[PDB]
Write a protein that binds this ligand. Structure first.
Ligand SMILES: CCCCCCCCCCCCCCCCCC(=O)OC[C@H](COP(=O)(O)OCCN)OC(=O)CCCCCCCCCCCCCCCCC
Ligand SMILES: CCCCCCCCCCCCCCCCCC(=O)OC[C@H](COP(=O)(O)OCCN)OC(=O)CCCCCCCCCCCCCCCCC
Ligand SMILES: CCCCCCCCCCCCCCCCCC(=O)OC[C@H](COP(=O)(O)OCCN)OC(=O)CCCCCCCCCCCCCCCCC
Ligand SMILES: CCCCCCCCCCCCCCCCCC(=O)OC[C@H](COP(=O)(O)OCCN)OC(=O)CCCCCCCCCCCCCCCCC
Ligand SMILES: CCCCCCCCCCCCCCCCCC(=O)OC[C@H](COP(=O)(O)OCCN)OC(=O)CCCCCCCCCCCCCCCCC
Ligand SMILES: CCCCCCCCCCCCCCCCCC(=O)OC[C@H](COP(=O)(O)OCCN)OC(=O)CCCCCCCCCCCCCCCCC
Lengths: 597, 504
């Protein structure tokens, strides 16, 4: 059960071996090394979970060494595992193994096969370190690792400059989030003297009995890091533009590892967030606003992958809303189910991209059910889990617990935002589905897991996360009824507009309608705003400074010396009479100076 | 006892490299490797026998070793060497960088290669002498005698593609900057010695006796300012930096000169060893100015690095930004930030050494430093773009490399002392990520922007590959296990910190 270090080391070994292989090995050997390392991590995770459940679900600690020891600054290299760490580790390892298998089938004949698998293995290793760390600095190591691996994998096809631009954009935005997280770490060490999660939770109420300002600052910066990595407000543009990379990269980023890191960080630091309730309600507000903007953008998108990206942003906003309403179990359960159906949706989208053999627009497609029915079924079940089809799919149950947690705590604005977001999700999901489709062992595995079979899995968060307040059974019944009615109404209504298109073209041609559609197509103008206030002044200051003005201003005395020497050399004209005259002038000056003192 | 031989072995090795030039052209590289390996192994021996991890702070002075021999008794001047944990880390770094410099110029088979080796070991012995001397005149003597070999090889052995006038201009700029600042430091040293002689009545240049010098507030400020002007030219601190990119760009093509002379941070050592214990009150009043100069250095060096089309100038401005971080660290008065500054000095030496070696190799293969003439080099080279990716990843301060340990320990201590400066510096870390990714995209990614970038390039030799991988392994070990380095320099850093905060 002491093989948590094994779950770190095995993807690290895979990354190191495949990186030093440098493409010389065969495709089968590279696939064996990468997928086998990730699958071995998954199997060790399975055995760890079995023994964890065998011992009554007790938190286990595995220290390795002391990372830093400078006086009172003691940072340890220690892993910890509880129910939340087990759930995140199981999700990361299993979904990453399925994505690794599909990528092994999908990347055949591509350049950089072993480089791709080395980068994904380092991605898995970094996220395992992120979820297994017992202190914030080791979690920051994992955080920076997943940021670097996402940069390396988004710009995988490095010859296309758009891919590199998207990767650089994602890395810079995530690094801004990581700087916010670093601020949180500095605050928490300066106040509590430690960065261990359990020790910080234990020492926070005693230290912050008088003033709670620095803890609120630390939790606000923790949320800043979380929205940096989970692609929320106000750092959400990178997920929109990260479609330049390949499809298993998108599946790993959206389902397995990258976007779940902020949700895990908020869930793991839940004691500090509960000590600052205003910041926790701000987490809920951020999630609600982000899912609203993501749904409204997802309806007006033009490509399949952009719709999937904004759907990922919407469900991460749902998880942030669930964390803000203290529905921690609902948030983690929705994390697992969303990992399942979003990985399935990305796999089916990659299959239909390979079938179309081009980056074709969705408006040309139609009547593909008679050619590729299995991909249609996978897309349909992934959308039904996405759009919360009642009593058939796990996403309906996860969103039901999220809405029950929102109702039971006494937040009305977040409740109605979640309801209209479920409506919006149904509209954009079946818009995409009926626009494209009208007019494989991993695929079976996450097709099964995108049904109630995936809802049967209960996350063991009893000892680690606090239980959600119980809604009344009658209120739960009406909430389930109205959630099913909202989802069915959205499905039927979107099927009504997007089955010829007559009413959609009315708003799709009117000037306020064109203005709203183009405003929601440009990520609500956040890309333009960030280009205007951050990127363009950076380029302007760089162009202004490119000639090194401080070097010239320090070179000014050399210019003065050259000018003074050239001026002084004019008195050396070579005339003897002027030399005698200068001697007499100097005699006059010396005599006058001696007389005036 | 073994420190006089620590300074003398590079000098005799370079002298013999010049003397046995007659026996062959490929002879003096082996002698150079032998003497740099001897200095490195002797430093490793004195580290292993030092027992610095079991040393407690017992005030200043406290040396592992010391030695005194009267040289100019008229002024009370003696060859006075000493060593403790911080200076030992600096001399071990000097030996490792000198070995790398010798390995870097291995294939330079020229008629006057023996004189280049003699100049290189004069430089290395001078850096070691600055790191070991505790007589003020003698320390200044080494501080200024590092200059002449460095000037002569920049002016004569420098970047061959540029004209000789450009190399001569860069060498003269570097010499004038550092020698004028050294003369200002000499003025401060002489004034301190005369003030102590007026207070007591004995001639001394000993650092341990000049510590208890009763001075008025304002004279101590001026002495501190002279020391700081020398240590700020060599740090580099803005705006006294431009000699550094012009000297890196006109350094010899191999890259050995960047390793031997520049990438050793004697100015940070001088600020820790001399500016803080001799003038603690003046350093305490000067701290906000130095911290804001460090912030300006961080952001200005980042913006300058992004603006370059030359890779070498980009790496030089990166060094400027990192040393802005170190300058913020030194004036905090914080033990955690001081230890972070030591780690950052070592990690910057290793990472900038790797960057400069890789840039020299890339210039050897593509014959240009212009980043608008290269692109898509990931598909053309076997090892260079990935190792450059590693060293640019370490450059931005990625955890798992020693730069992260140094930068973040600096920022932890600084946030305990100065929070706003720490916040601005972490956004400087964002800027570091921006320029590192810009260099990676402009050099190795995209499409080929010229004809030389469209051709398959030869793979690196095994010696350069192995020394780059040694730097990689040392950086990774520093990032994951910095504890031996912290235990080595805990006592000296603790004594300097206690003397600095128990005097103000
Ligand atoms: C720790 C758990 C996770 C926590 C988060 C950690 C995040 C920080 C990690 C820091 C390490 C650096 C990360 C980025 C390295 C990228 C290297 C790379 O691109 O490797 C791929 C490349 C092969 O690519 P390919 O295109 O096939 O070949 C090129 C020519 N054909 O490969 C090559 O060309 C060859 C290999 C190049 C260098 C590989 C990486 C070296 C550094 C790591 C290992 C160092 C040594 C470790 C052992 C020390 C001694 C015990
Ligand atoms: C998130 C990273 C997880 C860790 C794995 C990879 C880390 C980087 C690998 C290279 C650098 C290793 C540096 C640390 C080595 C161990 C340091 C140490 O102190 O070991 C002693 C410790 C037992 O002594 P203990 O009592 O715990 O110490 C207290 C005071 N002495 O000894 C032990 O407890 C034994 C520890 C064994 C560790 C084995 C690691 C094998 C790693 C294989 C893959 C390497 C990948 C390298 C590149 C990674 C990305 C940059
Ligand atoms: C509670 C809030 C509920 C909001 C949704 C209500 C449902 C009706 C409006 C949305 C559906 C619709 O008609 O959308 C039209 C247009 C996007 O449709 P689209 O497929 O992009 O246009 C076809 C040609 N491109 O959408 C627009 O142009 C913007 C419509 C704003 C309403
Ligand atoms: C062709 C080119 C060359 C020619 C043109 C360029 C000019 C060259 C000459 C420049 C230098 C001019 C002289 C500077 C020193 C002035 C000394 C002075 O006025 O001292 C007064 C006072 C002395 O101390 P006092 O208070 O009397 O002590 C007894 C009781 N306490 O002092 C004090 O009390 C302390 C005063 C401290 C501030 C004055 C010194 C400013 C130094 C500025 C440069 C350094 C700035 C910091 C670092 C920047 C970044 C590197
Ligand atoms: C352009 C490059 C070269 C730099 C410029 C040239 C040097 C400028 C130095 C300016 C010095 C101004 C001194 C002002 C007061 C002089 C008269 C006086 O009242 O002196 C007081 C004191 C003598 O009285 P005493 O009883 O001995 O006091 C003991 C306490 N020290 O006096 C003393 O004790 C001795 C005071 C010595 C003060 C330090 C002198 C050197 C300081 C370092 C160099 C200058 C500052 C840095 C560079 C500035 C910018 C270029
Ligand atoms: C948001 C609310 C909270 C606010 C916190 C503080 C500000 C955080 C700002 C977050 C948003 C920043 C988004 C930046 C995305 C940049 C992506 C991009 O378009 O990059 C283009 C360019 C690529 O670089 P290069 O390799 O030179 O390519 C050739 C030039 N086209 O690269 C560039 O032009 C570099 C642009 C760098 C911008 C850095 C901004 C740092 C701000 C620190 C404060």
């Amino acid at each position: 059960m002491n093989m948590l270090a094994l779950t770190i080391i095995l993807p690290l070994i895979g990354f190191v071996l495949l990186a030093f292989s440098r493409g010389r090995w065969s495709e089968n050997v590279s696939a064996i090394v990468g997928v086998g390392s990730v699958g071995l991590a998954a199997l060790v995770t399975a055995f760890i979970g079995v023994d964890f459940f065998a011992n009554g679900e007790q938190t286990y600690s595995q220290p390795l060494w002391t990372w830093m020891s400078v006086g009172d600054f003691n940072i340890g290299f220690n892993l910890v595992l509880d129910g939340l760490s087990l759930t995140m580790l199981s999700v990361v390892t299993g979904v990453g193994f399925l994505i690794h298998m599909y990528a092994s089938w999908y990347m055949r004949g591509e350049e950089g096969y072993s480089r791709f698998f080395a980068y994904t293995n380092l991605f898995i290793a970094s996220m395992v370190v992120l979820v297994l760390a017992d202190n914030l600095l080791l979690m920051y190591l994992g955080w920076e690792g997943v940021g670097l691996c996402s940069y390396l994998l988004i710009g995988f096809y490095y010859t296309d400059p758009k891919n590199g631009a998207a990767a650089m954009k994602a890395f810079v935005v995530t690094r801004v989030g990581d700087v916010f997280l670093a601020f949180a770490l500095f605050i928490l060490y300066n106040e509590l003297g430690t960065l261990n999660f359990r020790e910080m939770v234990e020492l926070a109420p005693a230290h912050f009995a008088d003033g709670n300002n620095m803890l609120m600052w630390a939790t606000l910066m923790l949320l800043g890091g979380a929205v940096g990595k989970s692609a929320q407000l106000p750092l959400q543009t990178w997920l929109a533009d990260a479609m330049a990379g390949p499809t298993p990269v998108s599946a790993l980023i959206h389902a397995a590892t990258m976007v779940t890191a902020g949700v895990y960080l908020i869930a793991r630091t839940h004691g500090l967030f509960l000590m600052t309730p205003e910041v926790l309600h701000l987490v809920g507000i951020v999630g609600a606003v982000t899912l609203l903007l993501a749904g409204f953008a997802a309806l007006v998108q033009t490509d399949i992958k952009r719709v999937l990206a904004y759907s990922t942003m919407s469900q991460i906003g749902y998880m942030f809303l669930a964390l803000g309403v203290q529905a921690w179990d609902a948030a983690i359960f929705h994390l697992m189910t969303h990992a399942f159906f979003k990985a399935l949706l990305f796999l089916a989208s990659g299959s239909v991209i390979l079938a179309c053999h081009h980056e074709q627009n969705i408006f040309k497609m139609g009547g593909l059910r008679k050619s590729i029915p299995l991909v249609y079924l996978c897309f349909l079940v992934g959308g039904a889990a996405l759009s919360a089809l009642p009593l058939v799919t796990a996403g309906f149950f996860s969103k039901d617990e999220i809405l029950a947690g929102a109702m039971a705590n006494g937040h009305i604005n977040l409740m109605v935002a979640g309801l209209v977001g479920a409506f919006m999700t149904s509209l954009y999901t079946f818009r995409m589905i009926f626009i494209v489709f009208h007019g494989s062992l991993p695929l079976i595995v996450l097709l099964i897991l995108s049904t109630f079979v995936g809802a049967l899995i209960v996350p063991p968060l009893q000892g680690v996360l606090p239980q959600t307040t119980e809604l009344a059974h009658g209120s739960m019944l009406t909430l389930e009824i109205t959630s099913g009615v909202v989802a069915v109404v959205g499905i039927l209504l979107a099927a009504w507009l997007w089955l010829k298109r007559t009413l959609v073209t009315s708003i799709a041609n009117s000037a306020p309608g064109r203005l709203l559609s183009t405003w929601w197509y440009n990520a609500w103008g956040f890309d333009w705003l960030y280009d205007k206030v951050f990127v363009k002044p950076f380029l302007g200051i760089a162009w202004l400074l490119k000639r090194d003005p401080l070097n010239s201003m320090m070179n000014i005395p050399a210019v003065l010396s050259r000018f003074a020497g050239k001026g002084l050399l004019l008195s050396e004209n070579g005339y003897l009479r002027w030399y005698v005259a200068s001697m007499s002038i100097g005699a006059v000056v010396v005599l006058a100076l001696l007389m005036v003192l | 006892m073994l420190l006089p031989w620590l300074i003398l072995i590079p000098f005799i090795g370079g002298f013999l490299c010049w003397q046995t030039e007659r026996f062959g052209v490929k002879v003096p590289r082996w002698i150079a490797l032998i003497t740099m390996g001897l200095t490195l192994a002797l430093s490793l021996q004195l580290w292993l026998q030092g027992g610095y991890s079991l040393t407690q702070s017992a005030g200043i002075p406290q040396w592992q070793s010391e030695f005194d021999m009267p040289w100019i008794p008229r002024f009370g001047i003696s060859i006075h060497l000493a060593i403790d944990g911080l200076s030992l880390l600096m001399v071990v770094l000097t030996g490792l960088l000198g070995v790398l410099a010798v390995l870097c110029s291995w294939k330079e088979i020229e008629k006057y290669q023996g004189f280049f080796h003699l100049n290189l070991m004069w430089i290395l012995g001078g850096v070691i002498g600055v790191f070991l001397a505790i007589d003020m005149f003698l320390f200044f003597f080494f501080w200024e005698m590092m200059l002449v070999p460095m000037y002569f090889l920049i002016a004569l052995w420098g970047h061959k593609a540029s004209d000789g006038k450009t190399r001569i201009t860069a060498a003269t700029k570097f010499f004038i900057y550092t020698q004028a600042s050294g003369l200002v430091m000499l003025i401060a040293i002489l004034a301190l010695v005369f003030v102590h002689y007026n207070a007591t009545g004995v001639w001394t240049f000993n650092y341990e006796e000049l510590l208890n010098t009763p001075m008025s507030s304002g004279v101590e400020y001026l002495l501190m300012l002279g020391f700081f002007i020398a240590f700020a030219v060599k740090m580099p601190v803005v705006p006294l930096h431009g000699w550094l990119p012009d000297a890196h760009s006109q350094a010899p093509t191999a890259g050995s000169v960047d390793l031997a002379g520049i990438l050793l941070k004697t100015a940070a050592y001088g600020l820790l060893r001399f500016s803080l214990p001799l003038f603690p009150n003046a350093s305490a009043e000067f701290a906000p100015i130095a911290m804001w100069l460090g912030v300006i250095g961080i952001f200005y060096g980042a913006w300058m690095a992004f603006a370059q089309t030359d890779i070498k100038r980009l790496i030089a401005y990166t060094s400027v930004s990192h040393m802005g971080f170190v300058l913020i660290a030194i004036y905090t008065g914080s033990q955690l930030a001081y230890q972070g500054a030591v780690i950052q000095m070592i990690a910057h030496g290793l990472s900038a050494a790797g960057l400069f070696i890789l840039c020299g190799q890339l210039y050897e293969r593509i014959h240009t430093r212009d980043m608008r003439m290269m692109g898509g080099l990931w598909s053309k080279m076997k090892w260079l773009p990935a190792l450059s990716l590693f060293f640019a990843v370490a450059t931005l301060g990625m955890p798992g490399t020693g730069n992260f340990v140094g930068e973040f320990m600096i920022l932890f201590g600084s946030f305990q002392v100065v929070p706003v400066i720490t916040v601005i510096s972490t956004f400087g870390l964002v800027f570091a990520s921006v320029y590192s990714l810009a260099m990676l995209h402009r050099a190795y990614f995209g499409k080929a922007k010229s004809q030389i970038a469209s051709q398959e390039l030869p793979g690196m030799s095994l010696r350069e590959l192995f020394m780059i991988l040694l730097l990689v392994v040392l950086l990774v070990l520093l990032g994951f296990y910095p504890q031996p380095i912290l235990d080595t320099s805990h006592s000296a850093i603790g004594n300097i910190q206690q003397w600095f905060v128990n005097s103000v």
